[PDB]
Every structure is written in structure tokens, then in C-alpha cells.
Symmetry: C3
Subunit: 329 residues, 3 copies
């Protein structure tokens, strides 16, 4: 919500309260999953060719006790400041989205699941700390519909090596016309010494790229995505040496509020030390959201797992149904 708008500064205070329950035979995917979000987004007119901005956003879990587990799963998601230069681009620095998510985002539209290859603290695939990002939308006022980005990532040496990284760079590009769109992105970075002493994954470089296509118009959404990761997909005991990742989704928006969705996700891991080849994501998803208005909604999401019992990286293979009730402002 815009709660301040005066003398060239605007300030949005936004958030949501999400009542949420999972039903599944798995232990870790069953029970209460309620949570809340809070953030600000501000914008200030400096002159005719320059505008400054900033944003912060946090996750408050609603399924902890008020005792020793109170802080579990709570965290800042975004935190950055930047400058917008008229037609000539934007630059911002802080905790933000990696450029490979410009591609991975196109199938990340399910009511509760989806988006499985874009994760936090994972080089360029999701939200990461220490990113410097330049974007130019509409290509300096001449080739509109054509968007481009370039990004630098500074080293983060963390106690948890699966959430660490060394220096890297990324780039992305997308074009839209008449409801059709296409996008691609590539990034690469150094791995840290601690990442190279883990049980899975060998190599000096982490690389991620993905590419995709969509039609998004006339109440219709379709998109398909393919990509690959080297020494970069995060697994339970380290990183996969290489992966092949694919997803696809189809949705329609009825005028009276309902929006059904069907999707399929499959990813295969390759040359895991002592294990070989094996699927690490594989499921069909069917669900729907009902929008009462722009502030209230409800949903059901049904994840139909198609991994098997002899899964050889030990990944769980049960189903889940999710039921959600959302108030947002």
C-alpha cells in the first residue's frame, strides 16, 4: 500500500498474512505452514533524468512456538538501494535476485509449489547477497521490447558451504511482442575451498544457464523452460556435477475469479560421486487459485510426486496437498 506520497518521495508499505496447511505422508511436509511477510519500497525524484529507490522485505514464520524455536526460518529476503537513469538504465547493489532467475521465473507461477531450481543463496538462480546489477529496458529508447542485464557477484564465505560462493558474473536477455516472449540467461562463478571438500561435486567453476518461451495474453498463460547447471545445483550432501532441468505450465483466468493451473517438472542429476545418474525432481502439479479481489484469495495445490522408492540420492517421494487463505496489502 502507498502510505506516503509527498514532495517527490513515495513510500509503499506492503505485506501479507498466509494461513496455510499441508497434507502429506511425509513428516516434514505435513502440518501447519502459516507465515507472514512485511516490506517497504520507496522512490524519490531527484531530477528529470534520475530517480533513487530502495526496498527491504522479511519473512516471519507463523508456525513456531513462543519458546526456544521462535526464530526458526525467519529471515530478510531482499535489501538493496539503486538509481534509475531515465532511458539509460538502472543500477542497484545489495541482496536481490540473480539474473538466471529472469529465465527460471517463467514457470514459477503455481499456487504453492513450482520454482524448484530457483533457490536462495545459490549463485545466480534466486535471491543472493552482494549482487551489483545493471539493467537496460527498451534498449536506450530504440529497440523496445528488448531487455538486457549484466551483473557482478562478490565472494560470500559462510559457515554453511552450501550457501557460500566466490566471485562471478551473469547476463540475461529477453524480448516480447504480441503476447509472445522469449528469454535466456547465463552465469558463472568460482567455488570456495570449503565447497570443494564436500562429498558431492568436483570442479573449479559453477555455471548456470536457462532459456524459455511463453505466451501471456488474452487470459492465457503458457511457458516452457530448459536449462543446465554444472557444480551448482544444491543437493543434500553437496552439489551435482551436471544437471538437466525442464518445466512447463498452462493456466487460464476466468472473469469471475477462478484460475486453474496444470504443470510438470523434471530434473536429472549426472555423475554424482559413488552414485551415477538419478532424478532429483519429478512431479505433476494440478491446482487452482480463486481471487476474491486484489486483497484476498484462496488456493489448493496438489503435487503428484512421480519419483520412486528406490530413489538413489535418498529424496522423499510422497504427495502433498496444500490449502491456503491469503490476506495481502
Amino acid at each position: 500500500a502507498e502510505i506516503y506520497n509527498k514532495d517527490g518521495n513515495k513510500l509503499d508499505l506492503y505485506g501479507k498474512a498466509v494461513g496455510l496447511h499441508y497434507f502429506s505422508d511425509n513428516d516434514g511436509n505435513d502440518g501447519d505452514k502459516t507465515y507472514a511477510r512485511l516490506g517497504f519500497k520507496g522512490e524519490t525524484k531527484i531530477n528529470d533524468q534520475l530517480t533513487g529507490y530502495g526496498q527491504w522485505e522479511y519473512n516471519f514464520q507463523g508456525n513456531n512456538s513462543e519458546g526456544a524455536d521462535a526464530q526458526s526460518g525467519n529471515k530478510t529476503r531482499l535489501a538493496f538501494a539503486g538509481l534509475k537513469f531515465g532511458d539509460a538504465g538502472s543500477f542497484d547493489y545489495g541482496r536481490n535476485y540473480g539474473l538466471v532467475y529472469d529465465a527460471i521465473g517463467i514457470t514459477d507461477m503455481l499456487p504453492e509449489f513450482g520454482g524448484d531450481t530457483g533457490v536462495s543463496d545459490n549463485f545466480f538462480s534466486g535471491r543472493t547477497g552482494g549482487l551489483a546489477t545493471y539493467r537496460n529496458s527498451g534498449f536506450f529508447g530504440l529497440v523496445d521490447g528488448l531487455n538486457f542485464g549484466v551483473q557482478y557477484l562478490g565472494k560470500n564465505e559462510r559457515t554453511d558451504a552450501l550457501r557460500s560462493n566466490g566471485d562471478g558474473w551473469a547476463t540475461s536477455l529477453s524480448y516480447d511482442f504480441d503476447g509472445f516472449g522469449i528469454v535466456g540467461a547465463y552465469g558463472a562463478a568460482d567455488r570456495t575451498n570449503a565447497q570443494q571438500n564436500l562429498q558431492w561435486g568436483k570442479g573449479d567453476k559453477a555455471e548456470q544457464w536457462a532459456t524459455g518461451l511463453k505466451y501471456d495474453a488474452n487470459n492465457i498463460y503458457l511457458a516452457a523452460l530448459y536449462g543446465e547447471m554444472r557444480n551448482a545445483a544444491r543437493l543434500d550432501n553437496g552439489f551435482a556435477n551436471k544437471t538437466q532441468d525442464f518445466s512447463v505450465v498452462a493456466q487460464y483466468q476466468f472473469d469471475f475469479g477462478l484460475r486453474p493451473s496444470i504443470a510438470y517438472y523434471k530434473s536429472k542429476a549426472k555423475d554424482v560421486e559413488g552414485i551415477g545418474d538419478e532424478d532429483y525432481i519429478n512431479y505433476i502439479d494440478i491446482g487452482a487459485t480463486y481471487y476474491f479481489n486484489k486483497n484476498m484469495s484462496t488456493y489448493v495445490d496438489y503435487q503428484i510426486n512421480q519419483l520412486k522408492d528406490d530413489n538413489k540420492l535418498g529424496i522423499n517421494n510422497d504427495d502433498t496437498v496444500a490449502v491456503g487463505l491469503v490476506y495481502q496489502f
Copy 2:
């Protein structure tokens, strides 16, 4: 404070800053006790028979250092979303108040102490996670003043068994007219396997109920409460097998802002393994609040303990004086 109200959505951002000091021999009840609260509460008109809503609230302690103890005592208190269907009731889901607090609340009006049998993560007696709640005010438009609710609780398997529960149900009912009110509530739920392995308390089911009466008019507040808990009152080393719980309060509001208060609290535990019967709450309370206006107040509260020296359940038995200065919005 209402900070936004536009096109059918309203958003109240509320909170307070409480400067607070305890005087006592206890040690765990003697230093600085300063804290702050922040929350939002929102409401959106969907159509003439349907409003959506959501609420979140958090506690930030003000008596920690900025070092390693910085997070001690910090937590989410409330987090839920719901739908109100005109006269046919309301439904919300998340972290909210258990229905037995509909009765326990009537003597929870002291300046600093009081409310001792209604606590967090304690089945239905206070704030608990995973509550699905139905309420109906005014009985479908037919009986003005008459309220009831029905509530389901999903199990919470936590590392701390004293803050856990299994599945359960609860219900409540109250009537008000001409300044008088009356209320009762009952709930029951399964206990977890770990709750059945603690040194105090044995049994498969936990039960809580309480009932009360009040007069609230002409600057006068009086109320009395009686109830009992089975395998559900939390003690130092587990749960009491049975309890008998009683409290009573009397207050008067002078026109120039001062509001004195006196109360008495007595609770008895029965058949504790290796101990037998013994009081676990027993005290007299004297205090006063002075309201400067609806945003500012100050108070003193004097708790006069009557538990016995070196008692057999190990409960501390000292007095405490509390002094507070409160800014709220």
C-alpha cells in the same frame, strides 16, 4: 492507527513502547523489563455478505544487549487470515487465541500481573499455532448479545514437549446484557508420546474448561472465574494431573483518569507424582493505572505472594512491584 483506507481496503498499523522495571528478591523478576510491540490488522470488503481480513503481531524485547543474547524473548504472537460472512459467522486460520481464553480473559485485567492460567502454546488456554476457528456473534441475527464458537486444533510435534499438542476440539458460549455477562468454554485434545514420558503428568487426553461472571458498567468492573485442567496445566517439570483454578477482580474508573485495582488468585494442583496436593498459584494484587489519554498511561502493580517457603513444587514465593510508562498508537 488507521494509515490507509481506500477503495474498500483498510490497514491499521498499531504498536507500543513500554518502559518497564521490576523490583523483587527473585532475580529472574528484578531487572529492566522494557519491551515493544508492532502489528498490522487489515480488512477488505469483497461483497455485501463477505469481508476478508488478516492480522499479524510481534514482540521485540527492549532489555537485551546488541550481542549474542539479542534475540532472547522475541517472537510472533499472532498470524492469521480469515473470511467473515455477514450474519452467518467468521472463519480464520493460523496462530490465534484458543477458545478457553474466552473465559480466562475476564479476570486478566490487572496493570502488570494476572492472567496466570492462560499461556502460550498450551492447548486452548492462550495463543497457539494451527487453530481453525468458527465464530458467530448475535446468533445469525436472531439473539442479540449471544456469542458462540467452535474450533479445531492440529497437532504440533515440537522439540519442546511442554509446548506441544495433538489434535483437538473446543467450544465456547457467552451472553451479555445490561452490563452483565456470563461465559463458559471447554476443550480437549490428545497428548503426544513425549508428553507421556515427562516426570509429572500421565494420561492420553488433555482437558481444559472454565466459566465466569462479570459486571461492566458505571465505571465499575467486577469479575469471577472458576475452572479446572486435566493433564494440561504446565509446571516446571511436566503437567499437573488435575487442577482447580480461581480468580476474582474489582476495579473503579475515576473520571479524571485514575483506575485502582485489587484482585485475588488461587490455583490448586492435585495428585502430582511424588508430592500429592499443593497450591501452584496463590497471591493478592494491589495496583493502579493512570490514563493521560488514549495514547499514554502509567501504572504501579504490587503482587503479594502467599505460597509457602521452600514449597514442594519448587515455585518461587517472593513479592514483586512493577512500574511502567506506556506510549501506544
Copy 3:
């Protein structure tokens, strides 16, 4: 930002997002330093002689992962409530600034570094919990420009002895006239039982004082500060028995937004068990801020260390450069 102003109550919601990066050969001062701040400050008119107020403020680090280190370095900075009595002063209680920071603050104007002797949970040099503070500005309306304060500090017995204190008191005084100002302040406190068993610093009593003056007008800022601490300057392994502390700074504000700065800081610790005398702070600082307007700015700060590589307290001696981009509201 002022977001509510109605019937005598107003509420300011304020904060900032700071993208910040450090460059240095010291590994503990290198990489991402992004963070964000959020707070409220409210005020309520009671009558012609009486205003209530309250404030809370929090620090959210932006350079943690979303995993197990998420809460690292996050904390409440301020939390207090108070009363303003027209001309005859103010009183507040909670977590606030100690009165010796009335003096130390005059050189705490660098873009990033500086302010080294005023720190959190350090008796009266910075922000501390449990402070009762009385101030009188303008000396009852009689002696204009002349400010006075007196303060009581309650005991904080914490697990970390380096962030503890016993009971104490402080006082300060300042005068301004014609762009010139002068200030001095003194406080003294008991030390806790555990503080007296550390490797460095002995005595059952702590003391702090500082004094300084400034010229602040016609786009010029100049100021110098000197003070001393007994059993109160916090070092790595306890407290220095005595210190001599000095700082000085000079700044000019150009009309088009630029503000360069130079400063020099030197503090010497004296009579350290097994060490004798040794410097614990020593550097030259050059930097500048560019203000785009009152909501957006950018800065570079260059810390030129002049401690020696064989320092007897083992304090690191490399240089650091900080670059920052700041949005605030």
C-alpha cells in the same frame, strides 16, 4: 516519514536501505556489508504543559544467508517511552543513548568510520538498556543555548561480561552561541562480580568522561574531542585500566551537494596487564558524501590505518575503503 497526524497524535515511520561494500586485506573487514533500518517515533499532546512520546528502532543485516546464520547481527537499537513538560524538561526510560555520548558525538560525523569510543552496552558511551534520563533544554527558558542532563543506570547482569554493568549515574552540560558550542559529560558506575575476573582491567568501579567543542555554521563543520575511561573501554579480552582518547574532524558543504571530510583518531590504552601502554585506535580518514536530495545519497570512505604490525594487543593494522549507496525515508 510522517504517516499519521490526527487529533493530537502523530506517528513517524522511518528507515533506510544501505548497499555497502568494504575493500581491505583484513579478512574480517572485507566484502558485503549491506543492512537496513526500520523504526517508529510517535508523539501525543496531553494538554498545554504535557506531551507523551515513544520510540523503537531495529537493525536488519542484509549480508546473511536465509539459512542458519539468518539472525546474525540483528537487534533492537532503541526502545523507550517518555514525558515532555513544556519548558521544564523531559523524562524517559528504556534503551536509549548514555549521557557521555552527548560529548563523543561531536566527532561522529564521518561517512562510514569514526565514532570509535561510543559503542553499544558500554555504560554511558552509547546505547544501553535500562536508562532513566532527565533533560532540560534552555534552562527553564531563562539561559538560552544552555542544556543540561542527569541520568540513572540500572544493573544489567548478562551472560557476556563485556556487555554488563552495575548501578550508576551520569550528567552532562552544553552551551551553544553564534555557531560555536561546548560540551562536557561524566558518568560512573559499579562493575559486576564477573567483570572483575577478566584478563584485562581491575577495580570494582568504572568511570567515563569526555569534553569537546565545535564550530558549525556557514557551510563549515569543525570539532575536537578528548576524554578518558577507567575500567570501561572494551577491548578483546576485557577492559583497559585507563585510556586517553582523542579525535578531530573538518568538513565543508558545497551547494551542489558534495561534502568532503578529513579526521584523525588516536586512542591509547594504558596499564594493560602484561602489556603496559599501547595504542588501540590510530588512523587518518578522508572521504566524501554526495547528497542527491534529503532521501538519497552515496559516499566513499578511506580509512588510513597507522597502527603497527607488531601491536602488543594484536589489533589489526590494514587499511579499508568503504563505498555506500543509501536510500532513506
